[model samples]
Target: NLDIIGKRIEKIKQEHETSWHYDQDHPYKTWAYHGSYETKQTASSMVNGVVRLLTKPWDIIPMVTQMAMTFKEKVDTRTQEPKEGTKKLMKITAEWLWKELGKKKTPRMCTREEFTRKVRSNAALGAIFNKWKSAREAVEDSGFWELVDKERNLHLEGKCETCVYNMMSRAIWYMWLGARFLEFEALGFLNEDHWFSRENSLSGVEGEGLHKLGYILRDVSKKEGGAMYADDTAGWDTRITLEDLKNEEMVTNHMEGEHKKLAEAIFKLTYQNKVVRVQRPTTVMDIISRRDQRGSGQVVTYGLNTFTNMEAQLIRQMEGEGVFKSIQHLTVTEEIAVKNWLVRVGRERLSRMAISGDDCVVKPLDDRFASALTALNDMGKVRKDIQQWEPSRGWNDWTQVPFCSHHFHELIMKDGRVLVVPCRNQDELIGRARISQGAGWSLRETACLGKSYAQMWSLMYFHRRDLRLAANAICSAVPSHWVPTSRTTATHEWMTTEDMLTVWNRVWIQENPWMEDKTPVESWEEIPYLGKREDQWCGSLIGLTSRATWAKNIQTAINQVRSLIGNEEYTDYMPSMKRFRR
Candidate 1:
């Protein structure tokens, strides 16, 4: 977070706060409203003014949409029309988008509702974009600040404060406008989804115009998502696109350091989360009723993924100085509602709909500072030594027991019960466990108790291993649900671990247990199989696997040999198969 945008807005706060009189209405020198120096845009007074002037969704979105539309128009007009009504849709990307930022000096942008229609027709959008573009480019080559200096340095110095306010508002926000588009173009779909992301991943060949690939960076992470496709792989800085156009195949490119950090911050931000932005209306609890399907209340302010990109960006100004912490994520409708509160125009019968909504009277810019800061803190609570298990560390037990019922739901339900494992009440766990990050506990899929127990059974002989406890759970005969497999190994009650080991050694050395002529019947069908273990030592695991239910260890005396399967002591295990894995 460079805090650069801070200097822009903060500069305005100080400028307006410092001067009681300044010529803002420009007849070159006409004085406008002048307040007492004590109240000369004092700290609290100007926040309303600053927010009113700058915090509209017009602050960023429509501009980004307009920029995207402009990219589409410029590429279409210069290249050629390639479709029925739509021109050849050029691949928009962050490279040129960010490049466009370094040269940003002027401004004028349109609306989301207006551009929504423009996206449907090439005929009308071109003229509107040309008008927007020329206004910007007409003053583009020379810096706005440079021209302002000429006006101030060559002219009177009385009102340069407005000049700074005017210039930085555009300049800093112009950078932010570029940053917002970079969110779509480079950072990927998590930040905000422009309809551009929904543009068909057009299937065809592009002529030699050298188009740059645009945003849709990170897919919707691993577990949950709101805006984009739910594919996981946080970094797109290394992923591919076609416009680089050499092999129609494999090669790659790099993102700038800023782009890298943007991704790093965002990817790390949304590790295991998704709040809601369901576009519909409802009550205080916000459950959508069964009728009229318009109006969303779930678009949380700024509380999505918090890794670095988002947490870092939303935290402080770019250089990371502190702003007040009221900023936070909101559900859909109130996000714009709150930002518009920053508008602060009272005694005016302007809006038909209440901007800030029923409960909230104030708004933050991103509306995500609450959740993002929480995520940032959550990541901090996690340690450098974080792993799947171990209550021995600063944390408590990571165990999550499961009941095997349905294929997916049964498995997922048990995992939400980590409080039961540590024997803590709701409040006790809140301060201790609530501080944990990304879903606050390990997933049942990663618990690994099955593998750990299997390995533990292999090592159990050293502890004067007892079978008396294991004897309690077995029924006199196989239960009705226990489906027996017709595999090679089966053992009688008399067979011992020593006998199993002898057979294991024999199978390893002789390697042909299936042939009775070559091998003794003592190790007949029992050792003959090479797949899914069926010998008596491991036969109990089959029952554990079949009858799907338990809270504690289902002792299966399966050997550690499976983990050692490819060691020099083991057999026909192919190194080729193992080596090829990525």
Candidate 2:
């Protein structure tokens, strides 16, 4: 009788095992394809190979040694089924008993024949419950038993419901349902030893009990889902949504919270994309996310492109040097103020570098650099006598070398590295690359900022005819002529000539002719720029000088010239003139 019900329970377990659709072929939905780089692929492979080889003694052999030392302690891999003496066996039996008889009521007095039937019925139900419980437990515990034990408390505590419940569901789906639960039940019960037993006659009713047990387990699991499924799957939902993979949120989400940390750890060790690794932004995002997992707040509070640890230190050093004192009062809390401050600093620094013939280094590329590059390029062919240019090496090389009247000197380092320092003869002044610390900027970003500044510097140089001032404006603002080792080149060819000129013209109009009264000066050295040159080639050009009454002065000068030439003769030259107030 028990055997009959046991068989039915085994069948239900089998049905449950095969029900859900599991995609073993494609564990992940779509490839994130975020981090893809061919060179990085090779590099990562070599890196991992080297790490494994070098760390074998400490990382790999120790585990093997421990296993060899405790060979007997290594649990039987041949069979996942619990031994009759195991604690799992005891718990499963106790659970089955509770399910079958824990809530049952005492029986009233009855006839002997009816009592016999009730006894058989109770035994049949007990057998079915035992079979169902055994099957479920075997499936749940197979590979998942250890995980269940570890995460069970988190589930009960409601600390990580999604993780707990989803883990539970996954265990049931893959470990329990995916395994041979029904077969285990059949092996445990339906044997030849009890083929001819009297209980076999009662097996028919046992079937109903077996089905009931499955329904109970299903109901229990579904009810337990209430807490776990509460917060949109709470980080255990393996399926990635568009929002989960898109933009900065993907990085922030992956790098935040407890469960996310575990997932990222797994991803770091397992999933990888070369292209994503090669990408600075993607790599930065990962770096930032990991830092955030460790509870880093201040470093990641602003944009990802903000300063690095070393860069922050350098900036602090510069602060100590009283360099940032000029802009120290700028409001960091306000977005616009911060942007304006950086832009102004970049512009001013580039101007200083251009005039002084200094090497450009880590600085924001803005209009100052843009105008300087433009002015130098627009002037006749680069003078080979001052700075040698090899057009064969490409246009970018020309931009860096230029036709500036600065002689180059090689500074040999102890490390056998040579540094190219630009100077005007053996004077104390020399051009040096700005210290960038360890922060990274993308190629496009460097070019974009440089282009804007190039235009500004070039326009200033053209109008003022002061190469030193123009060069200082450029070289100072530019952060570095040296591209990152990770990057292939400093700038793209598309940004040369045409683009620089366009940007230069726009910056010229805004910066030219004293746009505003006593506007912010580039630096303390800028005082001389306010006055007219001592030995000038010509008087000030149109809109050149900063005058309180520029229009009035121009009209007065024109009238004086007309008087010298005679009004009748000068009238032909002056087509029409607007009256000017004194």
Candidate 3:
């Protein structure tokens, strides 16, 4: 008799798994494709040849290393593009905001000055953002604050001194939801994962958000969400509402803490455009949203472009099979190591390398992540006296080469012979084929892995390069061309650029027509910037310049300032301006 009950229990569990599984071909509605059945075709059939060209296993000489091509899910191919597109997206969004916000009549009356500052705040969000909301959506909500008020009603009257929750919410949505999120999907700022992440201050936006702490309750019974004759065959109600910011109450007795870190960790590794399994309705409903999940719920966050996650799980399987003969990545985080490495390289006894801040090795299409060809060419270009091989000879004793690169490529060629090439000209000395195929294949593939090794070691060699030591953001703030000047704005850390403009205006104010109430605040070299660096605990004790107009004047000033700062000695152009007081 008990066996009959046991069979019934087993049947129930099996049906539960059937309901929640994510198999698209299954009879359940776990995964739905919106494509029309008439035009339907296999995804694999469509993406075949394009993807087939991806794997070149036999020509595995370059796989001599970087087997990187086949690392975990799909590894990152282009170094700079993964990180660069987001920053470039910043320029587009930030610029649009000023133009749009400038047209507004205002709570503060955007006098072009206010409009620029408000928009620059959006730019800071862009600078660090790694979202993209359409200004089109932001446009409909001219006073977007109207919707923000919908959620702000949730006891915002209990706000603490720093509780600018409603204020930040409007700004976040105007720029995003309506703008960006995630390495993959746009999870909007009101997303549960993003909200919970901010409450705990974690990555994604890396704690660039705020939220109140609270516990959530849900009804997780296996079935029975619909009426007998209801169209809601797939009903998911957790007794939660967008208006419910309740501290700690449960519709069903069991409570899941507002602390959803474990769930977030699992979602953290998940990229965009993928499926997720959610167990709660913890998603904030400031805007209209669903209550819970009966099947799978995707994890999401802020930022747009829905581009690639740029992260591939390509390395693990390769590592498991022992494809990489040797794998090492060199970068410096310690102080002493940096000092020894830089002095040995002869570029500095005093400054540092680009490590943290908005300008970093991991950012975008710059020297930090330059193209393999560009980097290969840089090795040759840096040494103008040395001839460029374009490297056709396999083993030339190109010993009279400049020595600055930081890689020693140890590749195994077809002959089963292992060869080592120093960053010296010898690395490119290997001869492949002169034909169209092998001609640039080895050259191309070599740079693919070449720069891979190049960046790893280069990072270690050059550490804290303090260009800001004498740097200024102003075009000619260096006063004397021999003095240093800064290149980019330090607006990455602040919510607005008013401070930048305030300092901007003060430069001319203090310098104009001689007012002698001398203070360090008035000293040109003493002005501070809002650029956040990796190591320091405070703002930079330097000023940043708006290298405007890209005219000969600004460019000339920037060049002189950079050269003078790095010179240890002077160039023919003795020095550097925006600026003077009228």
Candidate 4:
């Protein structure tokens, strides 16, 4: 075993000396200690140096790092894989959904044959497909997706999944709202059931389910004057009345801008009788619960799209209205309570009564500097290298050279392009350095060079008003549950409301027990190689994705989540229920 370890170490040294292909005087040539030690020393001396370094007086540091690494490994060794059902659920991917829909399967998108087959089907499957098509058409007409798509492509490139998902999700959501408008418009169910019955709740569970409402309306329509036929088509009129047309026009005009376009799309589908509309409090979660009522004994909480969105919206509204002075001022316990409240209320409402899934939050702006910064550091070197290689060609004036008079200074390129052989005026350098430090960069890096670093830092921490706005923007980038209780990843787990509250109540005490004592910290070196770059700056430059890829990933997750919640089993769930709220 000792000989094996010795050989492994020898192999590592050999790889270190020869694997990298950097030119002479390149920073990689002499950057790390191994570079000088392995390249200059004999094999025996190199081995001795490794032993010495490993056994240095500051050996406890390596011991701690090793311990931290092994601790996770040990825990993973004990951790069990999810249940068989969960494994099955994970297998219900986008390709699976495409196949289930009676179409030939492809990796990226549904085929034209699949699309046409869905449009013609009389079943609920056909309705959802029709809805997706019409909804896509409506949003496409508005061009908001195109604008955001361009922005995402320009910046995020391949990592644009989240953006595209949001677009699709939001469009689908509006189409849902539009479908409800149709039920009220044509059938007068809004007045008969919603108003007369005094059940104004978004979920029809206040009295009858939306499907039940549809049945009731159909019965009433059949019983109307001069209606006596074997079929239910006696009183049905496919014609768009001038009166109905006028009302629809007014409705469209009443709605402002993008909202109008979305409403138009929904009405277009309903007006054409393309899909059956269920104007009730039906969400993907509601469908699961209803399906369980028919068979399964297990009671799962409402889907993530249900209460999670509502609670997220609640927090966003409050935060937008300046309800909390600062997230920083809240104790860790308080933060947990907030999160627990969202989850608790979401479940409570799910079972007690149906709420409007339309108003549910799609994404939240997470401003916590903790998780974002960690993600940044993990890919910091790659980002820096990217910065080094990106072409410096923003300004049209190529002749306008950026001159640096001082040897210690750096030629600050406007974009991440160009290299002036040397690197600035004393006044300009001092002014920019002051700007960079205020933006939260290293004093030395700032003194030497500053780029678009100031812009991102200013966006993140400069103006309190701007910071909140930026936080809100970031919040829209993710679901609210992803927000952490602290600047750590451990708290990001899915938790029961009780467990979440319990952790929050106790986590604060661990940090600051006595009033006189300062808050405790785990370790400055908690993140690997975080030395000298731990500041909360350049976050915007960190995490990004392609819109198409992100959209597919989102779709995949949606399918997986649906399968997990039994939505996959009931292929008719989308068609039989109300509009797609999430």
lDDT of each: 0.20, 0.23, 0.21, 0.24
* Ranking of models by TM-score: 3, 1, 2, 4
Once superposed on the true structure, which residue ranges of model 1 sit more than 4 Å away at CA?
1-6, 18-179, 189-253, 256-379, 383-408, 411-582
Q: How many backbone clashes does candidate 4 have?
A: 20
Q: Write the per-residue lDDT of candidate 3 for residues 205-282, one digit (tens) a residue.
A: 223211000000001011122111100101111111111111111111121332132123212222111221121122
lDDT of 3 at 487: 15
Candidate 3 Cα errors over 4 Å, as ranges:
1-134, 141-466, 469-474, 477-491, 494-582
Report the lDDT tens digits of candidate 2 across residue range 268-363.
211111111112222121100010111111112111111111122122222323332232132334334333343344223212211100111212
lDDT of 2 at 561: 30
Q: Judge candidate 2 at residue 458 and give its lDDT.
A: 38
RMSD to the true structure for each prediction, in A, is 29.3, 35.1, 25.9, 32.9
Give model 3's TM-score versus the native structure.
Answer: 0.20
lDDT of 4: 0.24
For candidate 4, lDDT tens digit of each residue in 111-187? 33333343243212101222335433433343533543343342222121111000010112122312222222232
Top-scoring candidate (TM-score):
3
